[PDB]
Design an enzyme around this catalytic site. Sequence first.
Site, mmCIF file in Angstrom:
data_model
loop_
_atom_site.group_PDB
_atom_site.id
_atom_site.type_symbol
_atom_site.label_atom_id
_atom_site.label_comp_id
_atom_site.label_asym_id
_atom_site.label_seq_id
_atom_site.Cartn_x
_atom_site.Cartn_y
_atom_site.Cartn_z
ATOM 1 N N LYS A 155 -4.778 -9.647 -7.397
ATOM 2 C CA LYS A 155 -5.592 -8.966 -6.405
ATOM 3 C C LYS A 155 -6.682 -8.149 -7.136
ATOM 4 O O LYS A 155 -6.377 -7.432 -8.103
ATOM 5 C CB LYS A 155 -4.696 -8.093 -5.528
ATOM 6 N N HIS A 182 0.783 -1.246 0.000
ATOM 7 C CA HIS A 182 0.000 0.000 0.000
ATOM 8 C C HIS A 182 0.810 1.288 0.000
ATOM 9 O O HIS A 182 0.234 2.347 0.171
ATOM 10 C CB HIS A 182 -0.991 0.014 1.179
ATOM 11 N N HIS A 213 -3.088 -2.352 7.997
ATOM 12 C CA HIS A 213 -4.241 -2.706 7.191
ATOM 13 C C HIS A 213 -4.712 -1.450 6.477
ATOM 14 O O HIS A 213 -4.823 -0.406 7.104
ATOM 15 C CB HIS A 213 -5.367 -3.233 8.106
#
Length: 120
Positions: free
Chosen positions: A39, A12, A113
């Site tokens: 993904k 990310h 996350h």
Amino acid sequence: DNSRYTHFLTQHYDAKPQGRDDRYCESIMRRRGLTSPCKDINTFIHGNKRSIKAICENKNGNPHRENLRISKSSFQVTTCKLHGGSPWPPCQYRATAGFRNVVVACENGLPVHLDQSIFR
């Protein structure tokens, strides 16, 4: 060490991307090992890491919903969305560049996350 923070950066974070087009997505998704299987959706945050880490504190974040955190500042981001019907490589991506606040979960002051739903 936090392996989940390291994973967060791999999945990310991209400091200085340049051109954030489809080909950008197709390359970085490969580079970050996110293509076997492809993904479905993945967003990268740009800029410095300290601003992202700061979402875990009052400095640049608020508590959000059950156990998440939402940033005070807006970030340059790029969302890579799978297209073409197959779950398997070669993975074709459509890039959507954005500029907004982000939702993360933190552990010990570190992001572990990214909430992908806000980019869907």
